[PDB]
Design a protein around this ligand. Structure first.
Ligand code: CLA
Ligand code: CLA
Ligand code: CLA
Ligand code: CLA
Ligand SMILES: C=Cc1c(C)c2cc3nc(c4c5[nH]c(cc6nc(cc1[nH]2)C(C)=C6CC)c(C)c5C(=O)[C@@H]4C(=O)OC)[C@@H](CCC(=O)OC/C=C(\C)CCC[C@H](C)CCC[C@H](C)CCCC(C)C)[C@@H]3C
Ligand SMILES: CC(C)=CCC/C(C)=C/CC/C(C)=C/CC/C(C)=C/CC/C(C)=C/CC/C(C)=C/CC/C(C)=C/CC/C(C)=C/CC/C(C)=C/CC1=CC(=O)C(C)=C(C)C1=O
Ligand SMILES: CCCCCCCCCCCCCCCCCC(=O)OC[C@H](CO[C@@H]1O[C@H](CO)[C@H](O)[C@H](O)[C@H]1O)OC(=O)CCCCCCCCCCCCCCCCC
Ligand SMILES: CCCCCCCCCCCCCCCC(=O)OC[C@H](COP(=O)(O)OC[C@@H](O)CO)OC(=O)CCCCCCCCCCCCCCC
Ligand SMILES: CCCCCCCCCCCCCCCCCC(=O)OC[C@H](COP(=O)(O)O)OC(=O)CCCCCCCCCCCCCCCCC
Ligand SMILES: CC1=C(/C=C/C(C)=C/C=C/C(C)=C/C=C/C=C(C)/C=C/C=C(C)/C=C/C2=C(C)CCCC2(C)C)C(C)(C)CCC1
Ligand SMILES: CC1=C(/C=C/C(C)=C/C=C/C(C)=C/C=C/C=C(C)/C=C/C=C(C)/C=C/C2=C(C)CCCC2(C)C)C(C)(C)CCC1
Ligand code: OEX
Ligand SMILES: [Cl-]
Ligand SMILES: [Cl-]
Ligand SMILES: [Fe+2]
Ligand code: NA
Lengths: 31, 145, 30, 35, 36, 336, 27, 31, 145, 76, 67, 38, 348, 30, 31
């Protein structure tokens, strides 16, 4: 719907992006 | 042990409450104690009596096989063949058993059984396809006419 | 509202493409 | 609209002329090969 | 071991295969399945 | 002479040190593709409805007019225009240009020029790098397919309204109407194209699996196996002999590729030639040559038609056929 | 009570009904 | 004979030639 | 709303052909006792031979909130036949939840879909882990000798 | 073993197969032309797709007596 | 160095003390194969009952079995 | 083994894998957003 | 086995003979693969040559009926048989082989033997890779064809009313199946199918590109104009410049592979992932859980007669497909639809 | 007691045992 | 409101949590 689909899309964007950014920033600081 | 207890005390109503049992047309269903069916009708999928009989028999077999596996060590040939020293072999076989069970429960839910009542899960598509409720309604109208 | 979401998703995909091209990890020949 | 057509004709002619005289500018000599 | 040349064998086999294909294509215009 | 203006421009254009190569094919590719990209994005977002069928019944197409990403499209040019060239300056107003499908024609023409110059640019960079030149030949097959669906089929059918709409659901509409009018499924060239895409998937997975299966142990289990390859290493990272032996034991000994050169060629040639064939199939159905017609081919001894799977396909085609352009036909035959 | 009538009455509404699909070799 | 090679060849070849004769005969069935 | 019985001007009883499970949309067709189509809602309301107006179809409801009521106007006979295409006719409150008028799936359908998808994904997982177990010593690569 | 090009170039192969292969071809031809194919596989001959009783396509429409009904609907 | 000793761990220690202990030869593999084939036959029986490929006297194989 | 856990391993994610993951997430969002909004 | 006595049994002799290297490797998986695959292929050829579909579908489907290679098919059983296994000894055929052929039992024969043959071929991949000590990525990649076969030929008809709605083994029958999914499910609109199409097309692109990139970045390595003679199988160094390939594709397309490993894997990964996504979508279609309509656009179209999109056009086309296909395609429904209810356009 | 379906099922089990014995004999026939 | 407050609360939790987790994970990888 207009807003439940909105929060679904926002969460599906942000949570895996958060996971990927955590791993990448950790890696790039490591190297 | 747990399967035998669930089948002999819960679903029989000996100590537990039983399971949900309904009429064939989903009108007068309730949670009832269920007597086991030890004949060929016990393998009727829509027979509620098959569930306690299965759980009692399979629990007894599970207890006996567990005692066997407590006692008897595996052979070297089968140990090396199935890699019984590796936990990932157990993981592969467990995943195999789990998707076998998932296919079984998906088919059972889709085609209907005694363990998937229509008063709880809704009608099946095959009851519409084969005119189940339509046939019952028209038979009840033909009677009393 | 939904048009905003569609446009934002497309533009973000194009931004990821832009960054993957011009800010890639360079192939090192050693 | 005629101003737009004039501008587009100028742009297309410019890029096509660049293409043509670029391949006229000794292009088979611009390679890393021996020969 | 080697008596008849393999190229001649392949030529005869290919001729037979082409002939069978031509017969099958001819049968598309005659008999059953020929719309006539 | 490194000082004259044209020579400096030439050495910048043909430079192999720019991040993206330009070249003389690029000096046409970049402006045409940028024009096409700009117009496509703007039209896909905010274009007003287009009377595609020329029957004063416009099709919206754009997100701002209630479409999503799936159903949004740049709608093909009006059927009233047909094959006539319709630039912006040939319209009285931008609103008329938009109502009659001008953005589609602009994007299609610029995209065609851009992909032709992309192919030329691929050749040009291969030549500037000392490579061999046939990556452009490989790329000619998707270029042929795009040209067939955007230019050649409209030419054969007489109208750019018959081009593939620049969209997802528009692509599906193009496919369904194409099947209804030409029976593309029963076309051997399309069968070759399907064999090519299925074989390309099969052979990509098999190459891949094979190279991956024969990877030489250079890493530990806590690392990625890709870490066993270094960029620019001279040695081979896999055992081609072991992979070939596995493939020979799996299928047949002498039917396996013992030359990586020959294998790569096969991998290159198979989907490329099959996409060539299916693009030519689209281009030949542009002139109404169509797929195999086996309707009422089988009849009994009394002449009664025995229906086949071809007849069932024909029923489906009739279903698509009597429904497409529901208001655009005044005469029974679909000659236009 | 009239199984033939209930059969011929379920049939036009639904031809896939099991009463129609069962024992119809006799028909 | 009677090898795996021979058996694998013949299990395909003998029905293939039989079926080819059958289909060739079908080509001359005048309804 | 009660069972809907359809009749024509001649007085023979007609039945709406019920929508099969595949069809998102289904044409409204009224068939007599002997399997002959007697009425329909035509797509082409010109040179038609079986429309509700031409055949003169009335509908009578028995047993529900419309019991005893008979409708003869074609505009209402058409809508009741279109509703009888879906089976027994009910009245629905749509304002409470803002229903969109399109059918949903049952919990048994959702269960079956989720578990069949999980079953295939777990078949892949079982393949992957059996592969990992059997081919552990070559997991990082082959022996090169 | 022995190479395929070795066997296919030998005359013993061809004196065996110039009589085995045409025998199989003729066997298939006679299998079709004698009606034995129709008898074995149940496909109708071109004249027996319809009977005087039914003039449309058969419908099995029964599972547990499908043998009896396909016997009834087949070409006697 | 040794692990952490707990009373429950000492109680459960004999149940995890025979890792890698196997029988010589094939052991009970023949009996296991017999059990496996019997289980396969049983699963085929119930599959054919629920597929209606196996018809029995008192097995209705329909919702009327709820009656 | 000892007081520290010997099975410590360090997770790694390079920039190419970050770009692939971001592309996967955003492309899945683009593909499925029309269906989620319905 | 670890310098143990390991007294030989019949199993060791059987394994020694089964895993011996011959022209056709058998192995332990051969005892499943070769009979099942042979019977599936031979049954399909036999059905397309001789067996009719006149009683299950009312269709001519064999060469002996006049069909060609495109229009011949081993067809599914009648829908009234449901999901019956159609054993030749089963309660339908009851031992009669000819009536078993007429009733559609050959379809179940071919499907089940082909499924077990696919299992056997995957086991063959596993066994050969274990024999030659290679990683089992070929079998891992072959898991996706088996997933597609299972979901399409078994799971979908099992979710539907019977094997009748499974694909019939044949060219035009597969085309029927495809057009049926279009009309009845809007399978193009399904995102799982979209991911499958993306995987298949991207894998074909990857195959072509690669092959072209390798063939055009070759090292000289010889003197002749035929480059295929400039490779030896035991050669230790690479045959193609990875560095030049990377430079070319980075300057043409913007990105390029720098890792050969990762590239071969990616070429493995794309088609397998696409086929698995499409299999999940077909599983969804088994329960009629389709991505058929966009409800907001349907609302807007119902409340606005001006609003037309290509999606609405495709909905109309699907309605036409279903209405004009149903009577001949589902004979068990016995649909005698008058032409006046068939949706049509104008004139045409 | 034994239905025709049950009799055919038991005979099918016998036939399956027979064909497994046959393929074992084919394996040992080499 | 019922759902806009919901997405506001979810974003206000997740985005600063993502930022803090990125910084902490890179620091802890650097010990
Ligand atoms: C007194 C005896 C007794 C009684 C009366 C029962 C009664 C029952 N048992 Mg049984 N059972 C017993 C003892 C007993 N059992 C004992 C001693 C054992 C050994 C421990 C078992 C083991 C057992 C198993 C393992 C199964 C049952 C099942 C059942 C049910 C059969 C009807 C049904 O719904 O099947 C429906 C189920 C089937 C017909 C199974 C078909 C499975 C097929 C062959 C394979 C499916 C997966 C396959 C990989 C396909 C993949 C997908 C495909 C598209 C490719 C019923 C409740 C079944 C059950 O729980 O059903 C819900 C079941 O799976 N029993
Ligand atoms: C494509 C299918 C396939 C493939 C190739 C694999 C692959 C693997 N399996 Mg298997 N497995 C499968 C599906 C598959 N399996 C399924 C559906 C099941 C049931 C849940 C299992 C159960 C299973 C277990 C529990 C284990 C594995 C293991 C393994 C590994 C060792 C090989 C092995 O034991 O083969 C298994 C053998 C087969 C799949 C062949 C089965 C042939 C049967 C007997 C044919 C019977 C037909 C019969 C007539 C019935 C007809 C029914 C009809 C009427 C409906 C290997 C990685 C073992 C291992 O060591 O993992 C590390 C292990 O522990 N598998
Ligand atoms: C086996 C899993 C399972 C099953 C079968 C069900 C089934 C059900 N749940 Mg449920 N639930 C589950 C687990 C499950 N749930 C879990 C794990 C949660 C916690 C998150 C929930 C939380 C939940 C809520 C809170 C609600 C439901 C409701 C529903 C019912 C409505 C239909 C439905 O599922 O929505 C439709 C389902 C789908 C559209 C599935 C989506 C298809 C896949 C996942 C998309 C593929 C992934 C894709 C890449 C994602 C990208 C999207 C992005 C762009 C936004 C249905 C009976 C609803 C209801 O009626 O409540 C009474 C409801 O409001 N459930
Ligand atoms: C790799 C070997 C193999 C495999 C796994 C299959 C598998 C299958 N075949 Mg078979 N088939 C084979 C080889 C094989 N076959 C051979 C060699 C022949 C040629 C003679 C056939 C000819 C054939 C026919 C004609 C048919 C089958 C059918 C079947 C299916 C059901 C079988 C069944 O219910 O019996 C299961 C039987 C067992 C599991 C054997 C159990 C024996 C027990 C364990 C021993 C105790 C018995 C005791 C002595 C009493 C199944 C998919 C049917 C089919 O496809 O349905 C449409 C069918 O009608 N097959
Ligand atoms: C229509 C498409 C298609 C076909 C025909 C096909 C065919 C094949 N793929 C193989 C392999 C592979 N396929 C792979 C990936 C893929 N394969 C794909 C698509 C296909 N793959 C796709 C899209 C991918 C990407 C994921 C891999 C990774 C492999 C291999 O490793 C393997 C190989 O070596 O290839 C070189 C071969 C081994 C099969 C075999 O002998 O099993 C044994 C024979 C059996 C099981 C009999 C088949 C019975 C079938 C299931 C049912 C009966 C069908 C009838 C006989 C024919 C009906 C025909 C009509 C439908 C027209 C075989 C030639
Ligand atoms: C207004 C706007 C912007 C409008 C746009 C509207 C619009 C229509 C947008 C929608 C677009 C959109 C993103 C939709 C697609 C959604 C979709 C279907 C997603 C699928 C998602 C998915 C998970 C699919 C599963 C299958 C899968 C894994 C697919 C991946 C596909 C994939 C990326 C394939 C590769 C494609 C590709 C271009 C490869 C080139 C690789 C390459 C550079 C190799 C060259 C090369 C070769 C060599 O050999 C060597 C040696 C070297 C060195 C080398 O380099
Ligand atoms: C992956 C790797 C393995 C691949 C392949 C494995 C090899 C062979 C596979 C053989 C499959 C055999 C299928 C028979 C199942 C069957 O007949 O079902 C059909 C029958 C039910 O039969 C149906 O019953 C309905 C009841 O309302 C109706 O009466 C229908 O008319 C009737 O057809 O069910 C079974 O016999 C077993 C189902 C339960 C077991 C799960 C099967 C798999 C999941 C299905 C989910 C469906 C949705
Ligand atoms: C159908 C029509 C097919 C036309 C032939 C298409 C061949 C090219 C397809 C695209 C190849 C993509 C680059 C892949 C590429 O670079 O090709 C690699 C390969 C290059 O090999 P060579 O350079 O040794 O041979 C070609 C010439 O140089 C003369 O040997 O090309 C060929 O094998 C030639 C095929 C001749 C056979 C003709 C039949
Ligand atoms: C949320 C909002 C943010 C979203 C962000 C979206 C990002 C889109 C950016 C818009 C595109 C602008 C690119 C301009 C870059 C010029 C600099 C350059 O090319 O390097 C010079 C660089 C200079 O040589 P060097 O010494 O090697 O650095 O190489 C060149 O000379 C290449 C010249 C070609 C210029 C045309 C570039 C084509 C860009 C394609 C635009 C596509 C629009 C869609 C965007 C998605 C794809 C990216
Ligand atoms: C491809 C291939 C192959 C082959 C096959 C075949 C089978 C072929 C053939 C072929 C042929 C079979 C040929 C022939 C030819 C001939 C010619 C080329 C001729 C001629 C001449 C002329 C020119 C004529 C003239 C005339 C006239 C005009 C008139 C009348 C008289 C006369 C007749 C004299 C092989 C296996 C080896 C290898 C691989 C693949
Ligand atoms: C079903 C069944 C079974 C089985 C059987 C079998 C297994 C058999 C077979 C068989 C076979 C196995 C057959 C075959 C066939 C074949 C064919 C029919 C062929 C063909 C080919 C062709 C036609 C070719 C063409 C060509 C040429 C020559 C030229 C160029 C190239 C090409 C390729 C195009 C049993 C008894 C168990 C049981 C009962 C049922
Ligand atoms: O535009 Mn597209 O589809 Ca080739 O046909 Mn004429 O035009 Mn329209 O109609 Mn039919
Ligand atoms: Cl249209
Ligand atoms: Cl017209
Ligand atoms: Fe490669
Ligand atoms: Na029209």
């Amino acid at each position: 719907v207009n807003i439940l689909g909105l929060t679904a899309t926002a969460l599906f964007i942000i949570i895996p992006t958060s996971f990927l950014l955590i791993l990448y920033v950790k890696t790039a600081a490591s190297e | 042990l747990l399967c035998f207890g669930f089948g002999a005390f819960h679903v029989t109503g000996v100590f537990g409450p039983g399971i949900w049992v309904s009429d064939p047309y989903g009108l007068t269903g309730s949670v009832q104690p269920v007597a086991p069916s030890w004949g060929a009708e016990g393998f009727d999928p829509y027979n509620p009596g098959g569930v306690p009989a299965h759980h009692i028999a399979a629990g007894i077999l599970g207890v006996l096989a567990g005692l066997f596996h407590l006692c008897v060590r595996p052979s070297i040939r089968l140990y090396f063949g199935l890699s019984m020293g590796s936990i990932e072999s157990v993981l592969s076989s467990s995943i195999a058993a789990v998707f076998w069970a998932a296919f079984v429960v998906a088919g059972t839910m889709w085609y209907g059984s005694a363990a998937t009542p229509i008063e709880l899960f809704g009608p099946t598509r095959y009851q519409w396809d084969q005119g189940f409720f339509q046939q019952e309604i028209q038979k009840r109208v033909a009677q009393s006419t | 509202m939904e048009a905003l979401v569609y446009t934002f998703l497309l533009i973000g995909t194009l931004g990821i493409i832009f960054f993957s091209i011009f800010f890639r990890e360079p192939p090192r020949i050693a | 609209m005629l101003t737009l057509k004039i501008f587009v004709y100028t742009v297309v002619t410019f890029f096509v002329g660049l293409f043509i005289f670029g391949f006229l500018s000794n292009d088979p000599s611009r390679n890393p090969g021996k020969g | 071991i080697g008596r008849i040349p393999l190229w001649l064998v392949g030529t005869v086999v290919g001729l037979l295969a082409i002939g069978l294909l031509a017969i099958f294509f001819y049968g598309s215009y005659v008999g059953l399945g020929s719309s006539l | 002479e490194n000082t004259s203006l044209w020579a400096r421009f030439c050495e910048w254009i043909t430079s192999t040190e720019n991040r993206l190569y330009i070249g003389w094919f690029g000096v046409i590719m970049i402006p045409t593709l940028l024009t096409a990209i700009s117009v496509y994005i703007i039209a896909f977002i905010a274009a007003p409805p287009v009377d595609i069928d020329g029957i004063r019944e416009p099709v919206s197409g754009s997100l701002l007019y209630g479409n999503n990403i799936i159903t949004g499209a740049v709608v093909p040019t009006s059927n009233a225009i047909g094959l006539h060239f319709y630039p912006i300056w040939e319209a009285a107003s931008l609103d008329e240009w938009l109502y009659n499908g001008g953005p589609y024609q602009l994007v299609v023409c610029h995209f065609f020029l851009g992909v032709c110059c992309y192919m030329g640019r691929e050749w040009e960079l291969s030549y500037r790098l000392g490579m061999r030149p046939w990556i452009a030949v490989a790329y000619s097959a998707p270029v042929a397919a795009a040209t067939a669906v955007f230019i050649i089929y409209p030419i054969g059918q007489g109208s750019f309204s018959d081009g593939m709409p620049l969209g997802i659901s528009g692509t599906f509409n193009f496919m369904i109407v194409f099947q209804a009018e030409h029976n593309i499924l029963m076309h051997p060239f399309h069968m070759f194209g399907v064999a090519g895409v299925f074989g390309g998937s099969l052979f990509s997975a098999m190459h891949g699996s094979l190279v991956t299966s024969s990877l030489i142990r250079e890493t530990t289990e806590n690392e990625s196996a890709n870490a066993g390859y270094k960029f620019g290493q001279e040695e081979e990272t896999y055992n081609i002999v072991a992979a070939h032996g596995y493939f020979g034991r799996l299928i047949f000994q002498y039917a396996s590729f013992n030359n990586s050169r020959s294998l790569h060629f096969f991998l290159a040639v198979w989907p490329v030639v099959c996409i060539w064939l299916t693009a030519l199939g689209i281009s030949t159905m542009a002139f109404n040559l169509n797929g195999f017609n086996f309707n009422q081919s089988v009849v009994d001894s009394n002449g009664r038609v025995l229906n086949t799977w071809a007849d069932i396909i024909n029923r489906a085609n009739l279903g698509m056929e009597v429904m497409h352009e529901r208001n655009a036909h005044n005469f029974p035959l679909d000659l236009a | 009570q009239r199984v033939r009538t209930v059969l011929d009455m379920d049939d036009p509404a639904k031809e896939e009904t099991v009463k129609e699909l069962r024992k119809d070799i006799n028909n | 004979i009677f090898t795996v090679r021979w058996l694998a060849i013949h299990a395909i070849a003998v029905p293939t030639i039989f079926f080819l004769g059958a289909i060739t005969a079908m080509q001359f069935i005048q309804r | 709303l009660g069972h809907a019985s359809f009749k024509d001007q001649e007085g023979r009883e007609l039945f709406v052909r019920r929508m099969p499970t595949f069809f998102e949309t289904f044409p409204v067709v009224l068939i007599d006792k002997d399997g002959v189509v007697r009425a329909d809602v035509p797509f082409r309301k010109a040179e038609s031979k079986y429309s509700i107006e031409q055949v003169g179809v009335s509908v009578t409801f028995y047993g529900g909130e419309l019991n005893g009521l008979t409708f003869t106007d074609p505009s209402t006979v058409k809508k009741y036949a279109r509703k009888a295409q879906l089976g027994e006719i009910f009245e629905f409150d749509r304002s409470t939840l803002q229903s969109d008028g399109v059918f949903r799936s049952s919990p048994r359908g959702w269960f079956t879909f989720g578990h069949l998808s999980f079953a295939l994904l777990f078949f892949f997982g079982h393949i992957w882990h059996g592969s990992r177990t059997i081919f552990r010593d070559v997991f990082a690569g082959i022996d090169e000798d | 073993e022995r190479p395929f090009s070795d066997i296919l170039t030998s005359i013993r192969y061809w004196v065996i197969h110039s009589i085995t292969v045409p025998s199989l071809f003729i066997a298939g031809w006679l299998f079709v032309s004698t009606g034995l194919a129709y008898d074995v596989f149940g496909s109708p001959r071109p004249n027996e797709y319809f009977t005087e009783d039914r003039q449309d396509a058969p419908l099995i429409t029964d599972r547990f007596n499908a043998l009896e009904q396909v016997k009834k609907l087949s070409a006697q | 160095e040794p692990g952490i000793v707990t009373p429950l761990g000492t109680l459960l220690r004999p149940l995890n003390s025979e890792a890698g202990k196997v029988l010589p030869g094939w052991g009970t593999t023949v009996l296991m194969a017999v059990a496996i084939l019997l289980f396969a036959v049983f699963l085929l029986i119930i599959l054919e009952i629920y597929n209606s490929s196996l018809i029995l006297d008192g097995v209705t194989n329909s919702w009327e079995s709820l009656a | 083994m000892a007081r520290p856990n010997p099975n410590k391993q360090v997770v790694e994610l390079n920039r190419s894998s970050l770009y692939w993951g971001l592309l996967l997430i955003f492309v899945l969002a683009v593909l499925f957003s029309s269906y989620i909004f319905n | 086995i670890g310098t143990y006595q390991e007294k030989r049994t019949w199993f060791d002799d059987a394994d020694d003979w089964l895993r011996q290297d011959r022209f056709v490797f058998v192995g332990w998986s051969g005892l499943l693969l070769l009979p099942c695959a042979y019977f599936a292929v031979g049954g399909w050829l036999t059905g397309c040559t001789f067996v009719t579909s006149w009683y299950t579908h009312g269709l001519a489907s064999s060469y002996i009926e006049g069909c060609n290679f495109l229009t011949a098919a081993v067809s599914t059983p009648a829908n009234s048989l449901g999901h019956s296994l159609l054993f030749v000894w089963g309660p339908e055929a009851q031992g009669d082989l000819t009536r078993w052929f007429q009733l559609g039992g050959l379809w179940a024969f071919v499907a089940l033997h082909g499924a077990f043959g696919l299992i056997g071929f995957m086991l063959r991949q596993f066994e050969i890779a274990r024999s030659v000590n290679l990683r089992p990525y070929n079998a891992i990649a072959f898991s996706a064809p088996i997933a597609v076969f299972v979901s399409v030929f078994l799971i979908y008809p099992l979710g539907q009313s019977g094997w009748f709605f499974a694909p019939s083994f044949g060219v035009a029958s597969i085309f029927r199946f495809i057009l049926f999914f279009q009309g009845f499910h809007n399978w193009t609109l399904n995102p799982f199918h979209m991911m499958g199409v993306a995987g298949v097309l991207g894998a074909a692109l990857l195959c072509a590109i690669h092959g072209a990139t390798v063939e055009n970045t070759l090292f000289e390595d010889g003197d002749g104009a035929n480059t295929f003679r400039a490779f030896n199988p035991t050669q230790a160094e690479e045959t193609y410049s990875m560095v030049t390939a990377n430079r070319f594709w980075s300057q043409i397309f913007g990105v390029a592979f720098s890792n050969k490993r990762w590239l071969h894997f990616f070429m493995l990964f794309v088609p397998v992932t696409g086929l698995w996504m499409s299999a999940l979508g077909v599983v969804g279609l088994a329960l009629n859980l389709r991505a058929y309509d966009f409800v907001s656009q349907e609302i807007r179209a119902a409340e606005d007669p001006e609003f037309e999109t290509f999606y609405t056009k495709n909905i109309l086309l699907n309605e036409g497909i279903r209405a004009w296909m149903a009577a001949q395609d589902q004979p068990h429904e016995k649909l005698t639809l008058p032409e006046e209810v068939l949706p049509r356009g104008n004139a045409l | 007691s034994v239905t025709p379906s049950l009799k055919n099922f038991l005979l099918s089990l016998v036939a399956g045992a027979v064909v497994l014995a046959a393929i074992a004999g084919a394996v040992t026939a080499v």
